[PDB]
Design a protein around this nucleic acid. Structure first.
Ligand SMILES: [Zn+2]
Ligand SMILES: [Zn+2]
Length: 53
DNA sequence: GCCACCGCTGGC
DNA sequence: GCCAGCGGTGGC
């Protein structure tokens, strides 16, 4: 994909950490869904926006 | 130029 | 129809 190399540790992760800013924003963690980004541990190390890592 | 949103839509 | 999560952008 555009933002996924599909081959790094972050790309292979299936579980959200539940503690980063992005996770806390999620409805599944009680957040408002205002940021709308993947867990920081799941941000592709090669392809993601530098500030998402 | 950056970042905290928010519009949008492919995939289900 | 919902929703994960990407791309664009207003306001700084
Ligand atoms: Zn997280
Ligand atoms: Zn990757």
């Amino acid at each position: 994909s555009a933002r996924m190399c599909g081959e790094c540790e972050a790309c292979r992760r299936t579980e959200d950490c539940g503690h980063c800013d992005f996770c806390r924003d999620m409805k599944k963690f009680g957040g408002p869904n205002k940021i709308r980004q993947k867990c920081r541990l799941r941000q592709c190390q090669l392809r993601a926006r530098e500030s998402y890592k």
